[PDB]
Design a protein around this ligand. Sequence first.
Ligand SMILES: Cc1cc2nc3c(=O)[nH]c(=O)nc-3n(CC(O)[C@H](O)[C@H](O)COP(=O)(O)OP(=O)(O)OC[C@H]3O[C@@H](n4cnc5c(N)ncnc54)[C@H](O)[C@@H]3O)c2cc1C
Length: 368
Amino acid sequence: LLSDKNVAIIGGGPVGLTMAKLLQQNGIDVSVYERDNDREARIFGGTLDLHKGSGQEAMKKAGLLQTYYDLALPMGVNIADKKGNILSTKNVKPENRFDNPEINRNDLRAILLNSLENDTVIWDRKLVMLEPGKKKWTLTFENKPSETADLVILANGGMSKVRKFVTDTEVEETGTFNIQADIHQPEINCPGFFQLCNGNRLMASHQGNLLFANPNNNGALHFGISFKTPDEWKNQVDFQNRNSVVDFLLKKFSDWDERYKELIHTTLSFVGLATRIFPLEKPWKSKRPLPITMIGDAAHLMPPFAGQGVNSGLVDALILSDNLADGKFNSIEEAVKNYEQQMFIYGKEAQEESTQNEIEMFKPDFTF
Ligand SMILES: Cc1cc2nc3c(=O)[nH]c(=O)nc-3n(CC(O)[C@H](O)[C@H](O)COP(=O)(O)OP(=O)(O)OC[C@H]3O[C@@H](n4cnc5c(N)ncnc54)[C@H](O)[C@@H]3O)c2cc1C
């Protein structure tokens, strides 16, 4: 295959690790440079789920579907109202288990990580600078020895600072905002809400305030509250100390049932983040010194309320990965050129749904 050279993937998230695996399956030489300190760093967030057709195809090809099923956990979902009434409830039906079981972000990385040869990932590696060499890239790492690569694959999230050689387009705030926390022993610390989820993911929407929870992410309750960014914050409240956040949440939620409030009372620390999108507007630099591309969130960061992200990114993995091994191209530049073409197709389409959908809710109504 077209790589008797060496690849550098920047980013050990689910998309970056899948790349690594798909390449290394074909005897390609890959290293993943991850900035997490070690294998064991906690990944904050909800649970991923892999769709048939996309995410799961990624896993089928990596020879990892069964392992994914093993560790994943199917979940019904309830729609509830501001009051605690279950409006709807779709349960796991035996036949449709495998459609999209939820997996914990750390568990998934354990699966991927386990599938790579030793020392494929190089930990404690924060990429800060890239530089086109004679015939290969030079990667700069904060207070760590530099490295070289014939191909660089950016897979380092939606805030990647090293996007320039591919495009001058930059991420943008979408208009909405997300607060989220985890509650441990949710069954005694927030029994009302925990009992309300009754073993299913829970969602409720009220006057443009979204509450979404999963009662069982490896035994913790994860939840997030989303909303249109308050007119004032121009980019002012502080997620450092919680009394600030609690007053704010408890305000826009005073309307809501005591059970949800108890959710905002027990949570010890909150993390705030503005929804962003890396818009697939114009084409990317046709003029590139050395081979380089982007997959997953680096390529098309988009709002999550649709259910998008990662599947779309794992598809990137799949598609690029094949292009560079099916020998159906006479050069690397061609193969990446082609992948970037296909992904612009379904990328724009996804980003279209999620954006529009984001506008749907966060209005004065919704019904999922
Ligand atoms: C609030 C919220 C809820 C979401 N819910 C869902 C959901 O329910 N389902 C779903 O499918 N998606 C969801 N998403 C989307 C989602 O999870 C992303 O698409 C997914 O994380 C993308 O994977 P990735 O590998 O491309 O990027 P990342 O997961 O962000 O991986 C990037 C990796 O690169 C590393 N990194 C960053 N900078 C550097 C650097 N300079 N050098 C080296 N490494 C670096 C990071 O440590 C990280 O490990 C949600 C997103 C948000 C914000």
